[PDB]
Amino acid sequence: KPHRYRPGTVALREIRRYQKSTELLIRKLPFQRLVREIAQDFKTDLRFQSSAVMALQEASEAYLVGLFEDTNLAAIHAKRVTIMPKDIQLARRIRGE
Amino acid sequence: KPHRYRPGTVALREIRRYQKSTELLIRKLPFQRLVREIAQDFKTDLRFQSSAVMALQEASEAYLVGLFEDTNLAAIHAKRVTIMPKDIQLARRIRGE
Amino acid sequence: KRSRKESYSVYVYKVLKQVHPDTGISSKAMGIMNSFVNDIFERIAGEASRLAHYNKRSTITSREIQTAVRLLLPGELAKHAVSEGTKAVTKYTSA
Amino acid sequence: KRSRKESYSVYVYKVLKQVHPDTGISSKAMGIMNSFVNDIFERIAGEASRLAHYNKRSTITSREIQTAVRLLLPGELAKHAVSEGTKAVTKYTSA
Amino acid sequence: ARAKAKTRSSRAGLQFPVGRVHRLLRKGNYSERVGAGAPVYLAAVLEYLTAEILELAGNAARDNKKTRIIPRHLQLAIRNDEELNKLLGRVTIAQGGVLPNIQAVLLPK
Amino acid sequence: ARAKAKTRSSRAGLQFPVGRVHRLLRKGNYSERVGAGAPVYLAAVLEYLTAEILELAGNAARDNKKTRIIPRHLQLAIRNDEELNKLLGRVTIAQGGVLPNIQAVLLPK
Amino acid sequence: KVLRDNIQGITKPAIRRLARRGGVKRISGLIYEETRGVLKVFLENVIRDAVTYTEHAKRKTVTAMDVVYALKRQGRTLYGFGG
Amino acid sequence: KVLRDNIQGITKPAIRRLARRGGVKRISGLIYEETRGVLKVFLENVIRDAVTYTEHAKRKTVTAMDVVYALKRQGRTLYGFGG
DNA sequence: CACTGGCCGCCTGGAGAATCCCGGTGCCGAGGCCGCTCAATTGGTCGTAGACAGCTCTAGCACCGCTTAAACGCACGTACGCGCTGTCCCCCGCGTTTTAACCGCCAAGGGGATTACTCCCTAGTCTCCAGGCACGTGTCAGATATATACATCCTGTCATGTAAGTA
DNA sequence: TACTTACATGACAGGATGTATATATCTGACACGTGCCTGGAGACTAGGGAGTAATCCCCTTGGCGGTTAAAACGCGGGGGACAGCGCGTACGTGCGTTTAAGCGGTGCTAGAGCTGTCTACGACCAATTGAGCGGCCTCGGCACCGGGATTCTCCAGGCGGCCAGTG
């Protein structure tokens, strides 16, 4: 049989590697094109420096990742290792939106 | 046989009663004693305006009822109804402190 | 007599008598209104100062203020606030 | 012909060399330091302005900014910054 | 021969002061110079918000068959309105209590 | 004819600017006036905070076996101090990632 | 003159009334001491700020105005005592 | 020029790597949709603020300056882009 | 196999109390009146910041051309959530007993607050000079790349507990 | 009944790969040197903010007597919590494919940004007045008080359905 790990050990390696990681997790080009897609809905012919796309990007993993530590707190509270949507809106509602 | 309400029915009546109600749920004079005690911990021979004690009273009740709403959400999250210290610590950890 | 402690008494009372001529006001509610006006004024003024600092502006006119409204007040309240504020500034320029 | 950009470059480099003579600094870390200094300066200045406003004081003093250090900076950072500030104003007054 | 002292709020057709808002802006130390449109605009937005919240407060007071408004009615008025709740998420009303909002799972069957 | 020019930071014995921070307070519109010891105190506080975080950054760089500080080292410096997290909990970092934090049930076995 | 135990002055049924305002139906037996502790923590955070305001004001008597200012500093602005 | 549906450009493995940075054990298949929705809402709020900043300055290019100002407005102030 | 009486789940009716609905009364809270004051307003004047035009130059838009990394999709597989139910236990409901909270009533003085005084201080401005910023480069820590060693994770294989046959 | 022996599951061993461990290379971003100027700074001045003496009064602090609801404690009990077993399930991960993002390249201009004009505009000050707040009084909406209904709640035993005995 070929080599294959038990479920979650590769997830352990992924978590450890990516907390050690500082490089970018999301793709650059579709993120900039998504910012453009959202922007044309609010004002047409709108342009962006690459640095502003970088700053929106850093804010995007900042907000999202922080929501995932809140999600892990919620998930371990419910004695589960698998996260569910209600963890996300629960954390958002306790956070105060 | 003397009449006896089932457990929780009086609890729901308490929820509806105090939720409709607007008055203070802490006796004002032991709260005044407590706040003078904690004030003396930081600065000696402190004196309190009665309105200041009432304002700290409303603020304390506000923080407690907000945290109790958060722990209600945490308890109904966890497939339970009894709030626990783990629910309270979940609320305090999610709220960012 | 004592010093005047400035408040929003008669203004809130007049806007009540416009919107509801018959209903009354309690003093606790009246303090709630005073703290409400103070808090909203502080938020709008702080965001206006922040916007003036960002653009290197020594001037706060209605344009920064409607900017701060579009920031702080969400959506429907913001566009309505633009509506009566626009009516007010047009009536002001027409005196 | 470009416009001069104001930053904290050589100052952070100096204190970094004082606390660690043999180390270097990256430009991204310098952006982090400029943002940090600007943000903490803005927090302290804003709370100092609010302290001056609450007590009807029209001036910013070392006493009220020491109050702001007690307010913003928690725990041992507060008292260490108090020691640093008192020592600094002491040898500034003696100079 | 000076003209009659007529008021800026009446020039705006408003009741909230251009004068007090302008003075609190100047002495609040928010900018060096302040345009004339800023305090009249701010009085307009404050008057609209005040009119809206006292509208909801009066409707809640007549709903509770009472004539004089109380902070219970104010707090009820605030969290029936979702965008006002977004505006005032971190704000506590004194003696306002909490609007009845019971999670359905703890309700009896 | 004139006294020799002496920097006020060196008068206070600081590296952080008395002059630049004083000017930025005067043009930042926080008050009309500022006391003389206030910018000295503020520069001393900023120098203390930067000295602490740069000391922790140098410690992290020595732990990382690197000579030059990276914002990863700065994030490691901040999040491994509790009171700076009490100061900078709500501030997000560029290229810093997350502190290594795997919870107790998250670890296997 | 000195006070040592008034944290028990926030009685357990009074905590029950507060939880009834929070919509809590069932409260565990270990909850009450924890609520006393976290209320102690919040009062510590508020009163250090308020006393710091007071000693800036060179006053010995704590005022409700400093209460409003300390509460609005923490993002917990309280209507009903300002002005 | 005109775009419709690029929110799928934040790929599912991008969300997986984001959650791996957040320390997530298991990500359900339902999760990616509301994560895209939350990212939609958050970026909508941020760029609404930023567009209001730029339109205040009468420009047509969104800069990182107004971005970090918009993040400072929301209480998510970001270090490292000239704020 | 049908009738029918009995038994058990369950389903309905009824009874008591808790707050609501309806009166009854007394009271001080706010709404309005009066008086005062201080602060908004008007005009003029003087300085000044941003809107507008113009230019330019630079990085963003637009288009072009290779390269497998990312993405994705299927498939095997293993672990993941959770419902039933039992089981154990812990806190609400209520009654009773204590006790200090609340009311309410009275003395006293600490300091919050106000007014005045007088002096410490601090922005402003002219001017002078000097250290950080723009600009240029050169150079070694790190990005990159290639060869080993253990971690570690999973998987096989004997060691051993254990159950059964039988002398 | 104990001794022996075969079987199934767990303790011990070992391989494979991926990430750590060691070392060579080049390169550009860090780091040092240079011109500059503009921004920090020294002195003087005009002026005005706040620290402090004095006081007063009032509002907070201290003390005393009673009621009874708030608090506290105990009995009882029902509801809650939660873990084991099982059951169905759904992503995790391995691996081949696509394609489209990523990496390097080129052209133009939108507009970002700097510079000159000037003007709309805002700020400040004496006078003046007029709306807006301090203080007081009144009555009636509302707080406090009292009695019956509807609703809420909870319990028994009436009702229906099912089952088993019997003819």
Q: Nearest CA to CA, how far is F2 from chain H (Å)?
A: 39
Distance D51 CA to J63 C1' (A): 39
Residue D22, Cα to own-chain centre: how many angstroms? Answer: 24
User: Which residues of chain B does F89 touch, with a Cβ-Cβ cutoff of 8 Å?
Assistant: 96-97
Q: Does F86 contact D75 at a Cβ distance shorter than 8 Å?
A: yes
Q: Do chains H and E touch (3 or more CB pairs under 8 A)?
A: no
Query: What range does the domain containing A33 cover?
Result: 1-97
Residues contacting residue G69 through CB under 8 Å, at least 6 positions apart:
D50, D54, G53
**E40 neighbors E8 (Cβ within 8 angstroms):** yes
**D42 neighbors F17 (Cβ within 8 angstroms):** no
Distance CA D45, CA E29 (A): 13
The two tokens of residue E67 are: 């004539």
User: Measured between alpha carbons, how far is residue A13 from residues A10, A68, B51, E22 in Å?
Assistant: 5, 18, 58, 61
The enclosing H or E element of F77 equals helix F71-79
The two tokens of residue D29 are: 């870390």
Interface test mutation site (partner H, options A56, A69, A70, max chain H beta carbons within 10 A): A56
The two tokens of residue D37 are: 């200094």
Radius of gyration of chain G (CA): 15
The enclosing H or E element of H33 equals helix H31-56
DSSP B96: T
Look at the alpha carbons of E50, E53, E55, E60 in this order and tell me if their dihedral is positive or negative.
negative
Q: How many residues appear in chain E?
A: 109
Q: Tokens 């900076």 sit at which residue? A: D73
Distance A58 CA to J101 C1' (A): 19
User: Measured between alpha carbons, how far is residue A26 from residues E30, F70, G16 in Å?
Assistant: 40, 21, 48
Q: Tokens 């069932």 sit at which residue? A: G26
Q: Which chains contact B through at least 3 pairs of Cβ atoms less than 8 Å apart?
A: A, E, F, G
Residue C88, Cα to own-chain centre: how many angstroms? Answer: 12
Query: What range does the domain containing G70 cover?
Result: 1-83
Q: Does C54 contact H65 at a Cβ distance shorter than 8 Å?
A: yes
> How does DSSP assign G4-19, residue by residue?
---GGGS-HHHHHHHH
Distance CA A28, CA A35 (A): 11
Nearest to D42 by CA among D31, D50, D32: D50
Option in B21, B22, B62 nearest E92 (CB): B62
**What CATH number did the domain enclosing H71 receive?**
1.10.20.10
In order of their start, the domains of chain F are 8-87 (1.10.20.10)
CB-strand contact D34/I, under 7 Å: no
Coil, strand, or helix at residue D59? strand
Number of compact structural domains in chain A: 1
Residue C34, judged by CB atoms within 10 A of its CB (0-12, 13-18, 19+), counts as buried
In order of their start, the domains of chain C are 1-95 (1.10.20.10)
Residue C9, Cα to own-chain centre: how many angstroms? Answer: 15
Within 10 Å of residue D21's Cβ, how many Cβ atoms?
Answer: 8
Strands (E), chain E: 33-34, 68-69
Search chain A and give the residue with CA nearest H78: A59
CB-strand contact A47/J, under 7 Å: yes
User: Which residues of chain F does D76 touch, with a Cβ-Cβ cutoff of 8 Å?
Assistant: 83
Number of compact structural domains in chain H: 1
User: Which residues of chain D does F48 touch, with a Cβ-Cβ cutoff of 8 Å?
Assistant: 80-81, 84
Option in D19, D52, D89 nearest F54 (CB): D19
Q: Which residues pair with E68 in a beta bridge?
A: C24
Distance CA F7, CA A55 (A): 37
Distance CA A91, CA B90 (A): 10
Q: Nearest CA to CA, how far is H40 from chain C (Å)?
A: 17
Angstrom resolution of this structure: 4.0
CB-strand contact E27/J, under 7 Å: no
The residue type found at C86 is T
